[PDB]
Structures are given as C-alpha cells and as structure tokens.
C-alpha cells in the first residue's frame, strides 16, 4: 500500500461516513482536523463509521492493535504505533459510539487525518 493510496482510501472512508451518519460537513472537517466533540451523537457515529471500515474497531466493539498497525505502519514508525496501541487500548467505554470518538481522539494527538494529506 502506498502512501497515495491511503490517502484516497482515507478520503473515500472519509466521504463514506459522512454520506452514511448525515454529519454536517464542517463537523466532518473538525473531526479530520483533529477536534473530536466526543459526545456529539453525529461526531461519534461518524467516528464508528471511520474505525469498523478500517478494522480498527471489530464487529464486538474491540480495539485492534493488527487494525491500527495495518493502516498506521505507513504514516507513523514503530515506536510511535506501541505508544499509540497501548495508550488507546486503555480507552474502557460501553457505549460503542462514545468508544469510538474517543478512540478517534486518542489516534488523532498521534496523527490527525488532516496530516495525512501532508505526505
């Protein structure tokens, strides 16, 4: 996978989510900058939306370090994906939606989606 690659295949998740939660555009775009209302009920479907596409967050509401790695290993290095797999992996909520906004801003202080456009 390369790094053009991801970045549409980020895009189109991107567009994906946005066309299937009906999240209002800037709300998407404060999401893709890095600024999660985590408790905004369209910013954390959304938010869902983005991490099962990608297998980060399984069908039983799991947090996959093979998920996270899989996409990361090309935008961040080793050392940066432990710290990021451990830290989020202590992110403990029943509510799946809540979860994943969460977990969206947790990867987001690592490398927010808008970054990605910068390589």
């Keep these: ?9 980020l895009h189109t998740e991107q567009s994906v989510c946005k066309t299937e939660t009906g999240i209002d555009q800037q709300k998407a775009n ?3 900058e890095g600024n999660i209302d985590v408790e905004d009920k369209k910013v954390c479907l959304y938010c869902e939306c983005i991490l099962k ?3 980060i967050l399984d069908k039983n ?8 790695k899989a996409v990361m290993e090309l935008l961040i290095d080793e050392n940066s994906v432990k ?3 451990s830290d989020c992996s202590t992110i403990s909520e029943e509510n799946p939606c809540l979860k994943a ?19």
């Design 30 to 32: 404060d999401v893709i």
């Design 61 to 68: 509401n799991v947090f996959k370090p093979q998920g996270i």
């Design 101 to 119: 906004s969460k977990l969206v801003q947790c990867v987001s202080k690592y490398k927010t989606m808008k970054s990605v456009d910068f390589l």
């Design 1 to 9: 996978m390369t790094i053009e690659e991801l970045k549409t295949r």
């Design 83 to 85: 710290q990021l797999v």
């Design 53 to 55: 596409n990608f297998n």
